[PDB]
Each structure stands twice: as C-alpha cells, then as structure tokens.
Design a protein around this ligand. Structure first.
Ligand SMILES: [Zn+2]
Length: 369
C-alpha cells in the first residue's frame, strides 16, 4: 500500500464507520446466535476517542445502538473485553463485588517486536517479507495445537494492522474457561522464556514440541539460513554459539572460518551435537501469558483501523496462511477511495476479508445447529 497519511483519519474514520465497518457480521459474531440472554448486551467494549481519550465499560443494547454510537464516536481504536454479569455501562452503580466478568473468547497475541533478538533483516520498527515468515510459523504452530490438541473448532486469526497477529478462540465451552485453565493452556504452548536479559531462552520427548519442530523444519532452511543468514559471519554465528554449551566455540568458530556460508555451517553444527533449542529460539512463537490468562482482558477488535499504518485488522484465511501479505492489506484511505468510486461496500477490497469472517460465522452457526 501507499504510505498512509494519518492527518486524514478523522474524516476517513467517519466514512468508514458510516459505510464500511461490517456491523451485521460483527453483531452476528458477538451475539452468538442470540441463544443466551444478554450475551451481547453485557459485552464490554473500550474505545480511544478524539484527543486520545480512552474509555472503557461501554456496552450496547443491539446492533442499531452499536452503529449509532460508533458513528457518533468515530473511535481511533476499539477493544473487545469480557461478557459481564451486568451491563458494563452501568458498572459504577453495581454493588462492590457483584460486577463480574463471566465469559470471553480465549485470545492470543503474537507480535514481531518480541523477536528483536533473532531477526537480522529489520529495525525493531519495520517488518519485511523475510521476517513475516515468523508470523506464518506462529499461526501454524499455535493453530495446529488449538485444533488438533485441544479440539477447538472456532478459531479466528486476525492481522494486528501492523506487525502481529491475534487469535480469537470462540467455541462455546472455550468462552467459559476459567483464568486458571487459560493460564494452563498458555504454559502448555510456551517454550521461549526470558526477557531482553536472557541469552538462552529455550531449555529442553514432548509431543507438542516434536509437532512444532516438524512445522518449523519445513521453513527453516529458507527462513533461517537463506533469508536471515543467521551464520553469514562472525558476530551472528557468535549469537548462536552463545546458545551452545561451554566448550565448542573452538571447532565451530574455526570451521565457520573454513565453511563458506550459513547452509554449510548448519549442516556441520548438526553433525556434532541443541539443534532444536536453536530452531525454537529463532522460530517459535513468543506468547505473552498476560493477554491470554485473564477473562477480563481487552484485545484489539477485528476490523479496527491502525492509527499509524491505516491498515484494517483483517481476518486471515487459514487455507492461505503462507500467502498472507501484510503489505497488501488495505488501508482505510484505500478502501474509502474505492467506496467513493463504486458506492457499494461490496465493491471494495474489504469485501474478501469479510468473506473470510462470514465463513467463520457460518461454522459457528452450524455448531449451534
Ligand atoms: Zn524483516
């Protein structure tokens, strides 16, 4: 896309919320078939408004109310929270201890910024087609586990609008899970641990680990050795050696002198040994226990507009995950200009992402029978 001009946001958001934001589908999602009384009415939303004012515990009676209020506010940001015991918008007059978060989707947030230590292609602020593969591997690794291991059927993956991806797991039994169970699921999925301060972040037959390695193996040569060139030279192969036990920088150090490029140094490195701890530290999703653990946690809404890149937080088609290109995700300016020429929200580049969302909603409806 063309570089977004954020000075146009106020007028562009007005048009987007008036004519493009997919309210019918969004309500069909969060009302979950209307089978539980007040399920939508007790949903918390939060918004960031004019002047960067943040408000939470907003809630709405039905789709019309949500439309009217979003068109009044034209929010820069929208976050979705839990379903509560009472309407969030009356929480200040609910008795102490009685206002309780009851249900919420299980959510995950993987962001490129947590990989600064293992990519060589970008500054912490950029992404490129080389490092985006990290997100591809994250989706495959996490989605396989959610689908195959946990048996979760209703998984919506969503672009963050800039440099990450989110997952909303929406099964009926999943929305009821306790914070303790959510924590358990995160810890089951986590293998990379340690802040900036930690040089070795992976310490290892765990089936989930083997499964995840086998996914990584399909990408590793092209991603790590060919694209990231994690052994192009000394100050990078060093980083790897920092992960191998006390006593071998020697042999390796000197053969990396002899050997010519990352591919050779790798075929070598393997011979001696570890391989897995390396592959995982470089390729495995880094989670964030925080966002997934709490039933009341707020996460960016699908179909949000990113205030810096202008890009829409679009659903990602899992059947085309390897082809997903954040750089072709439409900006709000792009789709408003399409709408200006076509006069039909169906005749814009948003429509195909709404179709992905509709397939997700159709499966939810089928599950309810
Ligand atoms: Zn990059």
């Amino acid at each position: 896309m063309e570089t977004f001009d954020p000075t146009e946001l106020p007028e562009l958001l007005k048009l987007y919320y008036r004519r493009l934001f997919p309210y019918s589908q969004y309500y069909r999602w969060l009302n979950y078939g209307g089978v539980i009384k007040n399920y939508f009415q007790h949903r918390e939303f939060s918004f960031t408004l004019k002047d960067d004012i943040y408000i939470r515990y907003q809630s709405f009676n039905n789709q019309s109310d949500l439309e009217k209020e979003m068109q009044k506010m034209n929010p820069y940001k929208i976050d979705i929270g839990a379903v509560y015991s009472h309407r969030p918008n009356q929480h200040n007059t609910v008795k102490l201890g009685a206002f309780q978060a009851q249900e919420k989707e299980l959510v995950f947030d993987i962001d490129m910024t947590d990989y600064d230590d293992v990519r060589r292609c970008c500054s912490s602020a950029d992404i490129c087609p080389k490092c985006w593969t990290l997100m591809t591997m994250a989706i495959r690794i996490i989605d396989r586990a959610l689908k195959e291991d946990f048996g979760f059927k209703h998984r919506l993956w969503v672009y963050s609008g800039r440099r990450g991806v989110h997952c909303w797991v929406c099964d009926e039994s999943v929305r009821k899970l306790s914070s303790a169970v959510r924590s358990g699921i995160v810890e089951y999925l986590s293998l990379v641990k340690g802040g900036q301060d930690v040089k070795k972040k992976v310490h290892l037959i765990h089936p989930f680990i083997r499964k995840s390695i086998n996914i990584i193996k399909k990408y590793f040569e092209e991603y790590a050795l060919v694209n990231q060139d994690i052994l192009e030279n000394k100050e990078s192969w060093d980083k790897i050696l920092a992960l191998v036990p006390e006593t071998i920088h020697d042999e390796l150090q000197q053969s990396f002198q002899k050997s010519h490029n990352s591919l050779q140094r790798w075929e070598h490195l393997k011979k001696v040994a570890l391989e897995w701890e390396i592959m995982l530290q470089y390729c495995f999703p880094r989670l964030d226990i925080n966002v997934s653990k709490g039933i009341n946690h707020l996460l960016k809404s699908p179909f949000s507009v990113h205030p810096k890149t202008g890009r829409i937080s679009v659903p990602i088609d899992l059947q085309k995950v390897d082809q997903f290109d954040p750089f072709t995700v439409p900006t709000i300016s792009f789709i408003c200009r399409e709408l200006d020429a076509t006069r039909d929200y169906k005749k814009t580049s948003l429509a195909p992402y709404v179709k992905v969302f509709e397939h997700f909603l159709e499966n939810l409806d089928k599950s309810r029978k």
